[PDB]
Design a binder for this molecule. Structure first.
Ligand SMILES: Nc1ncnc2c1ncn2[C@@H]1O[C@H](COP(=O)(O)CP(=O)(O)OP(=O)(O)O)[C@@H](O)[C@H]1O
Ligand SMILES: Nc1ncnc2c1ncn2[C@@H]1O[C@H](COP(=O)(O)CP(=O)(O)OP(=O)(O)O)[C@@H](O)[C@H]1O
Ligand SMILES: CC(C)(CO)[C@@H](O)C(=O)[O-]
Ligand SMILES: [Mg+2]
Lengths: 281, 288
Protein backbone atom coordinates (compact mmCIF):
# COMPACT_ATOMS: atom_id res chain seq x y z
CA UNK A 1 0.00 0.00 0.00
CA UNK A 2 1.11 3.54 -0.89
CA UNK A 3 2.05 5.74 2.11
CA UNK A 4 -0.34 8.52 3.12
CA UNK A 5 -0.09 11.79 1.17
CA UNK A 6 -2.07 14.85 2.29
CA UNK A 7 -2.40 17.47 -0.48
CA UNK A 8 -1.59 21.06 0.43
CA UNK A 9 0.27 19.94 3.53
CA UNK A 10 3.96 19.30 4.11
CA UNK A 11 4.37 15.52 4.03
CA UNK A 12 7.64 14.35 5.53
CA UNK A 13 9.15 10.99 4.58
CA UNK A 14 12.42 9.57 5.81
CA UNK A 15 12.38 6.16 4.10
CA UNK A 16 13.54 6.14 0.47
CA UNK A 17 10.94 3.55 -0.52
CA UNK A 18 8.18 5.73 0.92
CA UNK A 19 9.02 8.85 -1.05
CA UNK A 20 9.67 6.67 -4.10
CA UNK A 21 6.18 5.14 -3.83
CA UNK A 22 4.44 8.46 -3.19
CA UNK A 23 6.31 10.18 -6.01
CA UNK A 24 5.31 7.37 -8.41
CA UNK A 25 1.68 7.50 -7.28
CA UNK A 26 1.54 11.28 -7.63
CA UNK A 27 3.04 11.25 -11.12
CA UNK A 28 0.31 8.83 -12.13
CA UNK A 29 -2.32 11.28 -10.84
CA UNK A 30 -1.35 14.16 -13.08
CA UNK A 31 1.46 15.85 -11.20
CA UNK A 32 4.94 16.76 -12.40
CA UNK A 33 7.50 15.92 -9.74
CA UNK A 34 10.09 18.61 -9.05
CA UNK A 35 13.16 17.79 -6.97
CA UNK A 36 15.16 20.41 -5.05
CA UNK A 37 18.20 18.76 -3.40
CA UNK A 38 19.46 20.44 -0.20
CA UNK A 39 21.48 19.81 2.94
CA UNK A 40 19.15 21.87 5.14
CA UNK A 41 19.81 25.20 6.90
CA UNK A 42 17.60 26.84 4.29
CA UNK A 43 17.91 30.49 3.25
CA UNK A 44 16.53 32.73 0.46
CA UNK A 45 18.87 31.11 -2.03
CA UNK A 46 17.21 27.73 -1.40
CA UNK A 47 13.77 29.38 -1.51
CA UNK A 48 14.50 30.64 -5.02
CA UNK A 49 15.03 26.98 -6.05
CA UNK A 50 11.76 26.06 -4.38
CA UNK A 51 9.85 28.90 -6.04
CA UNK A 52 11.26 27.93 -9.43
CA UNK A 53 9.98 24.36 -8.93
CA UNK A 54 6.58 25.45 -7.62
CA UNK A 55 5.75 27.65 -10.61
CA UNK A 56 5.78 24.71 -13.05
CA UNK A 57 2.13 23.86 -13.80
CA UNK A 58 0.98 20.70 -12.02
CA UNK A 59 4.08 20.67 -9.84
CA UNK A 60 4.44 18.70 -6.63
CA UNK A 61 7.69 19.87 -5.01
CA UNK A 62 10.01 17.43 -3.28
CA UNK A 63 12.72 19.03 -1.18
CA UNK A 64 15.36 16.60 0.00
CA UNK A 65 17.28 17.51 3.16
CA UNK A 66 20.31 15.29 3.48
CA UNK A 67 23.78 16.11 4.72
CA UNK A 68 25.74 13.83 2.37
CA UNK A 69 28.89 12.59 4.12
CA UNK A 70 30.41 11.55 0.83
CA UNK A 71 30.87 15.11 -0.38
CA UNK A 72 32.75 16.19 2.73
CA UNK A 73 36.51 15.81 3.15
CA UNK A 74 29.68 20.56 12.60
CA UNK A 75 27.34 21.15 9.65
CA UNK A 76 24.38 23.32 10.72
CA UNK A 77 21.21 21.29 11.35
CA UNK A 78 17.90 23.11 11.87
CA UNK A 79 15.14 20.52 11.15
CA UNK A 80 12.17 22.33 12.69
CA UNK A 81 12.98 25.70 11.14
CA UNK A 82 13.74 24.21 7.72
CA UNK A 83 10.43 22.39 7.71
CA UNK A 84 8.61 25.55 8.78
CA UNK A 85 10.06 27.45 5.83
CA UNK A 86 9.03 24.69 3.46
CA UNK A 87 5.51 24.73 4.90
CA UNK A 88 5.46 28.52 4.41
CA UNK A 89 6.39 28.03 0.74
CA UNK A 90 3.62 25.49 0.11
CA UNK A 91 6.00 22.58 -0.45
CA UNK A 92 4.17 19.28 -0.14
CA UNK A 93 7.02 16.80 0.24
CA UNK A 94 10.20 16.83 2.33
CA UNK A 95 12.52 13.80 2.06
CA UNK A 96 14.73 13.53 5.16
CA UNK A 97 16.66 10.25 5.03
CA UNK A 98 19.33 9.10 7.44
CA UNK A 99 22.89 8.36 6.29
CA UNK A 100 22.23 4.66 6.95
CA UNK A 101 19.09 4.71 4.74
CA UNK A 102 21.03 6.31 1.87
CA UNK A 103 24.17 4.21 2.32
CA UNK A 104 22.92 0.87 3.79
CA UNK A 105 25.96 -0.88 2.39
CA UNK A 106 28.49 1.91 2.95
CA UNK A 107 30.38 3.29 -0.05
CA UNK A 108 30.42 0.52 -2.62
CA UNK A 109 29.29 1.42 -6.17
CA UNK A 110 29.86 5.14 -6.78
CA UNK A 111 29.91 7.65 -9.62
CA UNK A 112 33.27 8.63 -11.09
CA UNK A 113 33.01 12.14 -12.63
CA UNK A 114 34.82 13.14 -15.79
CA UNK A 115 38.03 15.24 -15.60
CA UNK A 116 36.27 18.53 -14.93
CA UNK A 117 35.81 17.30 -11.36
CA UNK A 118 39.56 17.60 -10.75
CA UNK A 119 39.65 21.25 -11.78
CA UNK A 120 38.71 24.49 -10.02
CA UNK A 121 36.82 23.41 -6.85
CA UNK A 122 38.25 19.93 -7.39
CA UNK A 123 41.77 21.18 -6.71
CA UNK A 124 41.41 21.49 -2.90
CA UNK A 125 38.68 18.83 -2.75
CA UNK A 126 39.45 16.10 -5.31
CA UNK A 127 36.72 13.70 -4.14
CA UNK A 128 33.99 16.29 -3.58
CA UNK A 129 32.19 15.96 -6.88
CA UNK A 130 32.22 12.17 -6.89
CA UNK A 131 30.25 12.55 -3.65
CA UNK A 132 27.86 15.08 -5.14
CA UNK A 133 27.16 13.10 -8.33
CA UNK A 134 26.72 9.85 -6.41
CA UNK A 135 24.10 11.29 -4.06
CA UNK A 136 22.37 13.23 -6.84
CA UNK A 137 22.11 10.08 -8.99
CA UNK A 138 20.58 8.23 -6.02
CA UNK A 139 18.10 11.03 -5.29
CA UNK A 140 17.12 11.07 -8.97
CA UNK A 141 16.48 7.32 -8.93
CA UNK A 142 14.53 7.43 -5.68
CA UNK A 143 12.33 10.41 -6.56
CA UNK A 144 12.26 10.14 -10.36
CA UNK A 145 11.48 13.84 -10.84
CA UNK A 146 10.62 15.46 -14.17
CA UNK A 147 12.98 18.34 -13.29
CA UNK A 148 15.75 18.85 -10.75
CA UNK A 149 16.87 22.28 -9.51
CA UNK A 150 20.33 23.57 -8.61
CA UNK A 151 21.70 27.04 -7.99
CA UNK A 152 23.98 28.71 -10.53
CA UNK A 153 26.18 29.84 -7.63
CA UNK A 154 27.81 26.38 -7.68
CA UNK A 155 28.25 26.51 -11.44
CA UNK A 156 30.82 23.72 -11.72
CA UNK A 157 28.48 21.47 -9.73
CA UNK A 158 25.63 22.41 -12.10
CA UNK A 159 27.78 21.59 -15.16
CA UNK A 160 28.89 18.24 -13.68
CA UNK A 161 25.27 17.32 -13.00
CA UNK A 162 24.46 18.15 -16.63
CA UNK A 163 27.31 15.80 -17.61
CA UNK A 164 25.93 13.08 -15.28
CA UNK A 165 22.47 13.37 -16.89
CA UNK A 166 23.76 13.32 -20.43
CA UNK A 167 26.35 10.57 -19.87
CA UNK A 168 24.03 8.19 -18.07
CA UNK A 169 21.01 8.92 -20.33
CA UNK A 170 18.94 10.15 -17.42
CA UNK A 171 15.40 11.25 -18.23
CA UNK A 172 15.26 14.44 -16.19
CA UNK A 173 15.58 18.14 -17.03
CA UNK A 174 18.31 19.95 -15.10
CA UNK A 175 17.34 23.50 -14.17
CA UNK A 176 19.90 26.07 -13.12
CA UNK A 177 18.45 28.86 -10.96
CA UNK A 178 20.09 32.33 -10.83
CA UNK A 179 22.16 33.16 -7.76
CA UNK A 180 20.30 35.03 -5.05
CA UNK A 181 22.38 37.90 -3.70
CA UNK A 182 22.54 40.18 -0.69
CA UNK A 183 21.83 43.88 -1.37
CA UNK A 184 25.47 44.62 -2.15
CA UNK A 185 25.90 41.67 -4.52
CA UNK A 186 27.40 39.03 -2.24
CA UNK A 187 26.15 35.58 -3.21
CA UNK A 188 23.97 34.25 -0.40
CA UNK A 189 25.57 31.33 1.41
CA UNK A 190 25.21 29.79 4.86
CA UNK A 191 28.97 30.17 5.29
CA UNK A 192 28.72 33.99 5.02
CA UNK A 193 27.77 34.10 8.72
CA UNK A 194 31.40 33.33 9.57
CA UNK A 195 32.74 36.56 8.06
CA UNK A 196 33.69 39.27 10.52
CA UNK A 197 32.90 42.89 9.56
CA UNK A 198 36.17 43.56 7.71
CA UNK A 199 35.92 40.29 5.81
CA UNK A 200 32.25 40.84 5.03
CA UNK A 201 33.00 44.23 3.52
CA UNK A 202 35.96 42.87 1.54
CA UNK A 203 33.80 39.96 0.32
CA UNK A 204 31.83 42.30 -1.94
CA UNK A 205 34.91 42.22 -4.17
CA UNK A 206 33.99 38.84 -5.66
CA UNK A 207 30.67 39.93 -7.08
CA UNK A 208 31.93 43.41 -7.93
CA UNK A 209 34.85 41.88 -9.80
CA UNK A 210 32.53 39.61 -11.78
CA UNK A 211 30.02 42.26 -12.77
CA UNK A 212 32.85 44.65 -13.65
CA UNK A 213 34.28 41.94 -15.93
CA UNK A 214 30.90 41.25 -17.54
CA UNK A 215 30.66 44.89 -18.59
CA UNK A 216 34.35 45.24 -19.48
CA UNK A 217 33.82 42.27 -21.86
CA UNK A 218 32.84 44.46 -24.81
CA UNK A 219 36.59 45.18 -24.92
CA UNK A 220 37.63 41.53 -25.05
CA UNK A 221 38.49 38.58 -22.79
CA UNK A 222 41.73 40.05 -21.52
CA UNK A 223 39.99 43.32 -20.58
CA UNK A 224 37.33 41.35 -18.68
CA UNK A 225 39.90 39.32 -16.79
CA UNK A 226 42.08 42.32 -16.01
CA UNK A 227 39.11 44.34 -14.71
CA UNK A 228 38.08 41.48 -12.40
CA UNK A 229 41.62 41.07 -11.13
CA UNK A 230 41.88 44.82 -10.42
CA UNK A 231 38.73 44.73 -8.30
CA UNK A 232 39.99 41.71 -6.34
CA UNK A 233 43.38 43.47 -6.00
CA UNK A 234 41.61 46.44 -4.37
CA UNK A 235 40.41 44.28 -1.45
CA UNK A 236 42.40 43.42 1.67
CA UNK A 237 42.54 39.86 3.04
CA UNK A 238 41.09 38.19 -0.08
CA UNK A 239 43.30 35.28 -1.11
CA UNK A 240 42.27 34.40 -4.62
CA UNK A 241 42.47 30.69 -5.37
CA UNK A 242 41.40 31.07 -9.01
CA UNK A 243 39.82 33.53 -11.45
CA UNK A 244 39.08 31.71 -14.72
CA UNK A 245 37.14 32.48 -17.88
CA UNK A 246 35.78 29.30 -19.57
CA UNK A 247 33.10 28.39 -22.08
CA UNK A 248 29.64 27.65 -20.69
CA UNK A 249 30.39 23.92 -20.37
CA UNK A 250 33.65 24.84 -18.54
CA UNK A 251 35.91 23.89 -21.39
CA UNK A 252 38.39 26.43 -22.86
CA UNK A 253 36.90 29.87 -23.54
CA UNK A 254 36.03 30.57 -27.24
CA UNK A 255 37.65 33.39 -29.22
CA UNK A 256 34.36 35.27 -28.74
CA UNK A 257 30.87 34.24 -27.75
CA UNK A 258 29.36 33.15 -24.45
CA UNK A 259 31.40 32.07 -21.50
CA UNK A 260 31.45 31.95 -17.72
CA UNK A 261 33.85 33.71 -15.36
CA UNK A 262 34.44 31.91 -12.06
CA UNK A 263 36.22 33.02 -8.92
CA UNK A 264 37.03 31.48 -5.53
CA UNK A 265 38.87 33.11 -2.66
CA UNK A 266 39.66 32.58 0.98
CA UNK A 267 38.85 35.26 3.55
CA UNK A 268 40.35 34.13 6.82
CA UNK A 269 39.12 30.54 7.13
CA UNK A 270 36.06 31.01 4.93
CA UNK A 271 36.20 30.00 1.25
CA UNK A 272 33.79 31.91 -0.98
CA UNK A 273 32.89 31.33 -4.59
CA UNK A 274 30.94 33.13 -7.29
CA UNK A 275 30.58 33.20 -11.03
CA UNK A 276 28.85 35.09 -13.83
CA UNK A 277 27.75 34.81 -17.47
CA UNK A 278 30.14 36.65 -19.83
CA UNK A 279 29.55 37.54 -23.49
CA UNK A 280 32.85 38.32 -25.21
CA UNK A 281 32.68 41.36 -27.45
CA UNK B 1 7.44 7.70 -31.44
CA UNK B 2 8.99 5.54 -34.18
CA UNK B 3 6.88 2.78 -35.68
CA UNK B 4 6.25 -0.29 -33.52
CA UNK B 5 4.82 -3.31 -35.34
CA UNK B 6 3.44 -5.67 -32.67
CA UNK B 7 4.15 -9.39 -33.07
CA UNK B 8 7.17 -8.64 -35.29
CA UNK B 9 10.84 -7.89 -34.59
CA UNK B 10 11.33 -4.12 -34.49
CA UNK B 11 14.97 -3.02 -34.69
CA UNK B 12 16.00 0.39 -33.33
CA UNK B 13 19.52 1.76 -33.25
CA UNK B 14 18.85 5.26 -31.92
CA UNK B 15 18.67 5.39 -28.09
CA UNK B 16 15.86 7.96 -28.32
CA UNK B 17 13.79 5.64 -30.52
CA UNK B 18 13.86 2.68 -28.14
CA UNK B 19 13.43 5.01 -25.15
CA UNK B 20 10.29 6.53 -26.70
CA UNK B 21 8.82 3.17 -27.68
CA UNK B 22 9.56 1.58 -24.31
CA UNK B 23 7.94 4.57 -22.57
CA UNK B 24 4.89 4.35 -24.79
CA UNK B 25 4.54 0.61 -24.12
CA UNK B 26 4.99 1.00 -20.39
CA UNK B 27 2.27 3.68 -20.43
CA UNK B 28 -0.23 1.23 -21.95
CA UNK B 29 0.36 -1.33 -19.21
CA UNK B 30 2.85 -3.66 -20.89
CA UNK B 31 5.84 -4.59 -18.71
CA UNK B 32 9.20 -4.03 -20.38
CA UNK B 33 11.84 -6.74 -20.01
CA UNK B 34 15.47 -6.08 -20.92
CA UNK B 35 18.01 -8.75 -21.92
CA UNK B 36 21.45 -7.08 -22.38
CA UNK B 37 23.78 -8.94 -24.71
CA UNK B 38 26.90 -8.40 -26.80
CA UNK B 39 25.44 -10.44 -29.66
CA UNK B 40 26.77 -13.75 -31.01
CA UNK B 41 23.62 -15.31 -29.57
CA UNK B 42 23.44 -18.93 -28.54
CA UNK B 43 21.10 -21.13 -26.44
CA UNK B 44 22.27 -19.53 -23.23
CA UNK B 45 20.99 -16.16 -24.44
CA UNK B 46 17.75 -17.72 -25.63
CA UNK B 47 17.10 -18.97 -22.11
CA UNK B 48 17.32 -15.35 -20.91
CA UNK B 49 14.92 -14.34 -23.67
CA UNK B 50 12.47 -17.11 -22.80
CA UNK B 51 12.62 -16.16 -19.11
CA UNK B 52 11.75 -12.59 -20.14
CA UNK B 53 9.03 -13.71 -22.56
CA UNK B 54 7.14 -15.66 -19.89
CA UNK B 55 6.53 -12.64 -17.65
CA UNK B 56 2.79 -11.90 -18.12
CA UNK B 57 2.04 -9.05 -20.51
CA UNK B 58 5.71 -8.42 -21.14
CA UNK B 59 7.36 -6.91 -24.19
CA UNK B 60 10.97 -8.07 -24.56
CA UNK B 61 13.83 -5.75 -25.52
CA UNK B 62 17.11 -7.47 -26.32
CA UNK B 63 20.02 -5.06 -26.63
CA UNK B 64 22.97 -6.09 -28.80
CA UNK B 65 26.05 -3.92 -28.32
CA UNK B 66 29.70 -4.97 -28.18
CA UNK B 67 30.63 -2.46 -25.49
CA UNK B 68 34.13 -1.12 -26.08
CA UNK B 69 34.47 0.07 -22.50
CA UNK B 70 34.60 -3.39 -20.99
CA UNK B 71 37.47 -4.55 -23.19
CA UNK B 72 41.05 -3.86 -22.20
CA UNK B 73 43.55 -2.70 -24.84
CA UNK B 74 44.57 -5.38 -27.29
CA UNK B 75 42.70 -7.08 -30.08
CA UNK B 76 40.13 -8.35 -27.62
CA UNK B 77 37.52 -5.92 -28.89
CA UNK B 78 38.32 -6.70 -32.52
CA UNK B 79 38.40 -10.44 -31.82
CA UNK B 80 34.96 -10.49 -30.23
CA UNK B 81 32.64 -12.62 -32.35
CA UNK B 82 30.06 -10.80 -34.40
CA UNK B 83 27.17 -12.66 -36.11
CA UNK B 84 24.45 -10.00 -36.47
CA UNK B 85 22.40 -11.83 -39.10
CA UNK B 86 22.05 -15.04 -37.14
CA UNK B 87 21.35 -12.99 -33.99
CA UNK B 88 18.32 -11.23 -35.43
CA UNK B 89 17.09 -14.48 -37.00
CA UNK B 90 17.16 -16.09 -33.58
CA UNK B 91 15.25 -13.18 -32.05
CA UNK B 92 12.58 -13.40 -34.72
CA UNK B 93 12.25 -17.16 -34.11
CA UNK B 94 11.82 -16.39 -30.40
CA UNK B 95 9.00 -13.91 -30.90
CA UNK B 96 11.03 -10.97 -29.54
CA UNK B 97 9.44 -7.63 -30.46
CA UNK B 98 12.36 -5.26 -29.90
CA UNK B 99 16.07 -5.43 -30.67
CA UNK B 100 18.13 -2.36 -29.62
CA UNK B 101 21.35 -2.13 -31.64
CA UNK B 102 23.06 1.17 -30.80
CA UNK B 103 26.23 2.49 -32.38
CA UNK B 104 29.36 3.23 -30.37
CA UNK B 105 28.96 6.92 -31.16
CA UNK B 106 25.37 6.99 -29.85
CA UNK B 107 26.45 5.38 -26.57
CA UNK B 108 29.75 7.21 -26.08
CA UNK B 109 29.36 10.60 -27.83
CA UNK B 110 31.66 12.16 -25.23
CA UNK B 111 34.07 9.28 -24.88
CA UNK B 112 34.67 8.16 -21.31
CA UNK B 113 33.55 11.07 -19.12
CA UNK B 114 31.15 10.27 -16.25
CA UNK B 115 31.46 6.53 -15.48
CA UNK B 116 30.49 4.02 -12.81
CA UNK B 117 33.11 3.07 -10.24
CA UNK B 118 32.26 -0.47 -8.94
CA UNK B 119 32.90 -1.53 -5.36
CA UNK B 120 35.92 -3.65 -4.35
CA UNK B 121 34.53 -6.91 -5.78
CA UNK B 122 35.43 -5.55 -9.24
CA UNK B 123 39.17 -5.88 -8.51
CA UNK B 124 38.88 -9.57 -7.71
CA UNK B 125 38.51 -12.82 -9.62
CA UNK B 126 37.84 -11.70 -13.22
CA UNK B 127 38.81 -8.15 -12.30
CA UNK B 128 42.22 -8.99 -10.87
CA UNK B 129 44.07 -8.87 -14.23
CA UNK B 130 41.42 -6.62 -15.83
CA UNK B 131 40.96 -3.76 -13.31
CA UNK B 132 38.69 -1.71 -15.60
CA UNK B 133 36.52 -4.49 -17.01
CA UNK B 134 33.60 -4.23 -14.58
CA UNK B 135 33.51 -0.43 -14.60
CA UNK B 136 32.89 -0.89 -18.34
CA UNK B 137 30.13 -3.40 -17.71
CA UNK B 138 28.37 -1.40 -15.00
CA UNK B 139 28.61 1.86 -16.93
CA UNK B 140 26.97 0.38 -20.01
CA UNK B 141 24.33 -1.54 -18.05
CA UNK B 142 23.45 1.63 -16.13
CA UNK B 143 23.00 3.44 -19.44
CA UNK B 144 20.90 0.65 -20.98
CA UNK B 145 18.67 0.64 -17.89
CA UNK B 146 18.17 4.41 -18.17
CA UNK B 147 17.44 4.24 -21.87
CA UNK B 148 15.01 1.31 -21.76
CA UNK B 149 13.70 1.67 -18.19
CA UNK B 150 12.68 -2.02 -17.98
CA UNK B 151 10.70 -3.47 -15.07
CA UNK B 152 13.14 -6.42 -14.94
CA UNK B 153 16.56 -7.08 -16.41
CA UNK B 154 17.90 -10.59 -17.08
CA UNK B 155 21.46 -11.86 -16.64
CA UNK B 156 22.94 -15.33 -16.78
CA UNK B 157 24.36 -17.07 -13.73
CA UNK B 158 27.30 -18.18 -15.91
CA UNK B 159 28.94 -14.78 -15.39
CA UNK B 160 28.17 -14.92 -11.68
CA UNK B 161 30.52 -12.15 -10.55
CA UNK B 162 28.99 -9.88 -13.18
CA UNK B 163 25.48 -10.75 -11.91
CA UNK B 164 26.47 -9.93 -8.32
CA UNK B 165 28.00 -6.62 -9.40
CA UNK B 166 24.84 -5.70 -11.28
CA UNK B 167 22.79 -6.42 -8.13
CA UNK B 168 25.20 -4.08 -6.29
CA UNK B 169 24.73 -1.42 -8.97
CA UNK B 170 20.94 -1.66 -8.68
CA UNK B 171 20.91 -1.56 -4.89
CA UNK B 172 23.62 1.13 -4.54
CA UNK B 173 22.06 3.59 -6.99
CA UNK B 174 18.42 2.87 -5.95
CA UNK B 175 17.50 1.68 -9.41
CA UNK B 176 13.83 0.74 -9.79
CA UNK B 177 14.34 -2.54 -11.65
CA UNK B 178 14.34 -6.19 -10.59
CA UNK B 179 17.48 -8.16 -11.47
CA UNK B 180 16.69 -11.71 -12.59
CA UNK B 181 19.42 -14.31 -12.63
CA UNK B 182 18.87 -17.18 -15.05
CA UNK B 183 20.50 -20.63 -14.58
CA UNK B 184 23.44 -21.50 -16.79
CA UNK B 185 22.57 -23.38 -20.01
CA UNK B 186 24.92 -26.30 -20.70
CA UNK B 187 25.79 -28.63 -23.56
CA UNK B 188 24.85 -32.32 -23.13
CA UNK B 189 28.15 -33.15 -21.38
CA UNK B 190 27.94 -30.21 -18.97
CA UNK B 191 30.03 -27.54 -20.77
CA UNK B 192 28.64 -24.07 -19.99
CA UNK B 193 27.54 -22.49 -23.27
CA UNK B 194 29.62 -19.48 -24.22
CA UNK B 195 30.40 -17.68 -27.44
CA UNK B 196 34.06 -18.37 -26.68
CA UNK B 197 33.47 -22.13 -26.97
CA UNK B 198 33.84 -21.69 -30.74
CA UNK B 199 37.60 -21.23 -30.13
CA UNK B 200 38.06 -24.73 -28.70
CA UNK B 201 39.37 -27.20 -31.22
CA UNK B 202 38.01 -30.79 -30.97
CA UNK B 203 40.61 -31.84 -28.39
CA UNK B 204 40.19 -28.73 -26.20
CA UNK B 205 36.43 -29.15 -26.46
CA UNK B 206 36.83 -32.69 -25.12
CA UNK B 207 39.08 -31.50 -22.28
CA UNK B 208 36.80 -28.56 -21.40
CA UNK B 209 34.22 -30.89 -19.85
CA UNK B 210 36.54 -30.90 -16.84
CA UNK B 211 35.32 -27.52 -15.56
CA UNK B 212 31.71 -28.56 -15.15
CA UNK B 213 32.71 -32.08 -14.07
CA UNK B 214 34.96 -30.55 -11.38
CA UNK B 215 32.22 -28.21 -10.15
CA UNK B 216 29.53 -30.86 -9.94
CA UNK B 217 31.91 -33.32 -8.28
CA UNK B 218 32.64 -30.57 -5.72
CA UNK B 219 28.95 -29.85 -5.14
CA UNK B 220 28.33 -33.49 -4.20
CA UNK B 221 31.57 -33.89 -2.24
CA UNK B 222 30.57 -30.86 -0.15
CA UNK B 223 28.62 -33.01 2.32
CA UNK B 224 32.11 -33.77 3.63
CA UNK B 225 33.12 -30.10 3.95
CA UNK B 226 34.85 -27.32 2.04
CA UNK B 227 38.26 -28.97 1.82
CA UNK B 228 36.71 -32.16 0.40
CA UNK B 229 34.78 -30.12 -2.17
CA UNK B 230 37.77 -28.07 -3.33
CA UNK B 231 40.07 -31.13 -3.42
CA UNK B 232 37.53 -33.09 -5.53
CA UNK B 233 37.36 -30.21 -8.03
CA UNK B 234 41.14 -29.88 -8.10
CA UNK B 235 41.57 -33.60 -8.79
CA UNK B 236 39.25 -33.45 -11.80
CA UNK B 237 40.97 -30.33 -13.15
CA UNK B 238 44.42 -31.90 -12.52
CA UNK B 239 43.40 -35.00 -14.52
CA UNK B 240 42.42 -32.86 -17.50
CA UNK B 241 44.92 -32.53 -20.33
CA UNK B 242 45.75 -29.01 -21.38
CA UNK B 243 43.65 -27.25 -18.78
CA UNK B 244 45.53 -24.49 -16.96
CA UNK B 245 43.67 -23.25 -13.92
CA UNK B 246 43.66 -19.51 -13.33
CA UNK B 247 41.60 -19.72 -10.14
CA UNK B 248 39.28 -22.05 -8.22
CA UNK B 249 37.56 -20.37 -5.28
CA UNK B 250 34.73 -21.08 -2.92
CA UNK B 251 33.03 -17.92 -1.69
CA UNK B 252 29.94 -16.74 0.14
CA UNK B 253 27.10 -16.24 -2.39
CA UNK B 254 27.52 -12.47 -2.39
CA UNK B 255 31.25 -12.91 -3.14
CA UNK B 256 31.77 -10.11 -0.61
CA UNK B 257 33.49 -9.32 2.72
CA UNK B 258 31.79 -12.29 4.39
CA UNK B 259 33.19 -15.74 5.20
CA UNK B 260 31.66 -18.86 3.67
CA UNK B 261 28.88 -20.07 5.95
CA UNK B 262 26.77 -22.94 4.62
CA UNK B 263 25.73 -21.53 1.21
CA UNK B 264 28.37 -20.60 -1.28
CA UNK B 265 29.40 -20.40 -4.88
CA UNK B 266 32.36 -22.28 -6.34
CA UNK B 267 33.97 -20.40 -9.23
CA UNK B 268 36.57 -21.55 -11.69
CA UNK B 269 38.43 -19.88 -14.56
CA UNK B 270 40.81 -21.90 -16.74
CA UNK B 271 42.68 -21.63 -20.00
CA UNK B 272 42.62 -24.21 -22.78
CA UNK B 273 45.19 -22.88 -25.24
CA UNK B 274 44.36 -19.20 -25.61
CA UNK B 275 40.69 -19.66 -24.67
CA UNK B 276 39.77 -18.67 -21.12
CA UNK B 277 36.64 -20.47 -19.89
CA UNK B 278 34.60 -19.70 -16.77
CA UNK B 279 32.02 -21.68 -14.86
CA UNK B 280 30.49 -21.65 -11.38
CA UNK B 281 28.05 -23.64 -9.30
CA UNK B 282 25.93 -23.31 -6.14
CA UNK B 283 27.53 -25.17 -3.21
CA UNK B 284 25.88 -26.18 0.08
CA UNK B 285 28.37 -27.14 2.78
CA UNK B 286 27.50 -30.20 4.88
CA UNK B 287 24.17 -30.74 3.09
CA UNK B 288 23.01 -33.94 1.38
N1 LIG C 1 22.66 32.23 -3.26
C1 LIG C 1 22.15 31.14 -3.84
N2 LIG C 1 21.34 31.30 -4.93
C2 LIG C 1 20.79 30.21 -5.57
N3 LIG C 1 20.96 28.92 -5.23
C3 LIG C 1 21.79 28.78 -4.12
C4 LIG C 1 22.41 29.81 -3.39
N4 LIG C 1 23.16 29.29 -2.36
C5 LIG C 1 22.98 28.02 -2.50
N5 LIG C 1 22.18 27.61 -3.53
C6 LIG C 1 21.80 26.25 -3.95
O1 LIG C 1 21.22 25.49 -2.87
C7 LIG C 1 21.56 24.10 -3.02
C8 LIG C 1 22.18 23.60 -1.67
O2 LIG C 1 23.56 23.95 -1.43
P1 LIG C 1 24.25 24.20 0.13
O3 LIG C 1 25.69 24.07 -0.01
O4 LIG C 1 23.63 23.17 0.95
C9 LIG C 1 23.80 25.67 0.63
P2 LIG C 1 24.89 26.84 0.68
O5 LIG C 1 24.31 28.18 0.92
O6 LIG C 1 25.67 26.82 -0.63
O7 LIG C 1 25.80 26.53 1.97
P3 LIG C 1 27.38 26.59 2.21
O8 LIG C 1 27.79 28.09 2.48
O9 LIG C 1 27.67 25.71 3.47
O10 LIG C 1 28.07 26.03 0.94
C10 LIG C 1 22.55 24.07 -4.24
O11 LIG C 1 21.82 23.80 -5.47
C11 LIG C 1 23.07 25.45 -4.26
O12 LIG C 1 23.71 25.80 -5.50
N1 LIG D 1 25.43 -20.65 -20.97
C1 LIG D 1 24.76 -19.58 -20.56
N2 LIG D 1 23.61 -19.74 -19.79
C2 LIG D 1 22.89 -18.67 -19.34
N3 LIG D 1 23.19 -17.36 -19.58
C3 LIG D 1 24.35 -17.23 -20.36
C4 LIG D 1 25.16 -18.26 -20.88
N4 LIG D 1 26.23 -17.74 -21.62
C5 LIG D 1 26.01 -16.45 -21.50
N5 LIG D 1 24.92 -16.06 -20.77
C6 LIG D 1 24.42 -14.73 -20.45
O1 LIG D 1 24.09 -13.98 -21.63
C7 LIG D 1 24.39 -12.57 -21.37
C8 LIG D 1 25.27 -11.96 -22.47
O2 LIG D 1 26.64 -12.46 -22.43
P1 LIG D 1 27.60 -12.55 -23.74
O3 LIG D 1 28.98 -12.15 -23.33
O4 LIG D 1 26.86 -11.68 -24.75
C9 LIG D 1 27.66 -14.02 -24.31
P2 LIG D 1 28.79 -15.00 -23.89
O5 LIG D 1 28.39 -16.42 -24.33
O6 LIG D 1 28.96 -15.00 -22.37
O7 LIG D 1 30.18 -14.60 -24.64
P3 LIG D 1 31.76 -14.79 -24.30
O8 LIG D 1 32.13 -16.31 -24.26
O9 LIG D 1 32.59 -14.11 -25.46
O10 LIG D 1 32.05 -14.12 -22.94
C10 LIG D 1 25.03 -12.53 -20.00
O11 LIG D 1 24.05 -12.12 -19.02
C11 LIG D 1 25.51 -13.92 -19.79
O12 LIG D 1 25.77 -14.28 -18.42
C1 LIG E 1 26.09 -7.31 -19.41
C2 LIG E 1 26.69 -7.00 -20.78
C3 LIG E 1 25.63 -7.19 -21.89
C4 LIG E 1 27.21 -5.56 -20.80
O1 LIG E 1 27.79 -5.27 -22.07
C5 LIG E 1 27.95 -7.89 -21.07
O2 LIG E 1 28.93 -7.71 -20.03
C6 LIG E 1 27.62 -9.41 -21.16
O3 LIG E 1 27.72 -9.99 -22.26
O4 LIG E 1 27.24 -10.01 -20.08
MG1 LIG F 1 27.14 25.35 -0.79
Amino acid sequence: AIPAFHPGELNVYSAPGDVADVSRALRLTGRRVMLVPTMGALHEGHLALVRAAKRVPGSVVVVSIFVNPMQFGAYPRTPDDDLAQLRAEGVEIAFTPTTAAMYPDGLRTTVQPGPLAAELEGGPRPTHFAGVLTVVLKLLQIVRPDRVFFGEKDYQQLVLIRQLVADFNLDVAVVGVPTVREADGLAMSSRNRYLDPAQRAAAVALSAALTAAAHAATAGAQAALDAARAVLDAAPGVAVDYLELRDIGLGPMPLNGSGRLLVAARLGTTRLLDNIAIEIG
